């Protein structure tokens with residue numbers, strides 16, 4: 001089973017290639033990491049296994065879900081440190097995913113009910129509704145298009161959160177640049193209608209993600225930085241006219257950051273629509289992997305067998321699993337044994353209970 005061959009993710013010597021994908025679960029009440037998170041990550045941790053946390057706030061304005069954790073306050077750092085210690089006691093490696101939702105927010109989630117920020121003033125279309133704190137669904141509002149000074153300020157929010165993650169004991173951070181959130185709102189030409197140096201050309205649209213990645217690499221080292229993108233997921237109105245070329249332009253900028261840094265990133269993490277135009281989705285995935293000088297994590301609808309095939313054929317170095325990890329805390333061992341997997345319950349993906357639908361999925 002090639003899923004269980006060791007892999008050197010830079011300084012981190014992984015014992016197997018099954019990765020916990022980042023997933024928002026909304027148990028970090030008042031944006032403070034809770035003991036329930038520590039139990040949840042500890043359940044999933046394995047010796048030498050790699051975990052990526054749920055998206056984590058970089059600023060008071062960066063949220064668009066209820067009760068998601070932040071890492072911009074010292075109080076949050078203190079509570080994260082307790083979770084990281086528990087996970088490190090099982091021998092796992094853990095990165096914190098830094099997340100800004102951009103225009104995918106709502107007054108209820110913003111300080112003083114202020115407008116969310118974006119590359120653009122265009123709201124997400126009415127085809128999408130935002131989950132509200134009371135469980136109803138609301139309308140995505142018109143965002144405020146930020147200028148270049150405020151862009152540099154958001155970059156600094158990423159830099160400070162990366163340092164905070166290191167202070168909490170995280171092994172590294174992942175830049176959330178996927179799923180139509182703030183970074184994807186600069187990347188995709190279906191969203192980014194700017195006429196300054198952050199819009200128009202491929203190069204201009206890749207400026208934001210490049211500046212974020214360079215900032216965090218300069219703060220904590222490239223080998224502690226992973227980057228997640230989703231060129232071909234159109235979630236929250238996030239489409240590009242040429243996904244493969246956008247993906248290849250991002251990869252070129254990561255390759256250059258590595259050459260100029262003298263060092264490799266932890267990984268590039270590409271995620272695709274779950275229900276898959278199969279062989280063509282595979283085209284995109286292999287083309288980005290082949291373009292990128294470094295470790296590649298594939299994600300989106302992978303099964304035990306497709307994960308094995310992915311590593312065996314050289315298509316990916318690591319495979320991340322999301323939904324199956326929700327309901328199988330011991331997914332790694334289940335994959336090793338080819339043991340049958342537990343169903344998950346969508347109804348408790350984003351509820352607040354510290355146990356139900358969170359830590360009470362049974363082991364094998």
Ligand SMILES: Cc1cc2nc3c(=O)[nH]c(=O)nc-3n(C[C@H](O)[C@H](O)[C@H](O)COP(=O)(O)O)c2cc1C
Pocket residue numbers: 021022023024025054055097176178228271274299300301302320321322323324349350
């Ligand atoms: C409930 C839920 C929450 C998620 N939260 C995040 C997130 O915070 N950041 C992120 O990059 N992806 C997030 N995702 C997407 C997953 O990381 C993963 O890419 C997706 O579920 C597809 O992989 P899978 O088919 O193995 O589930 C989430 C997905 C689900 C279902």
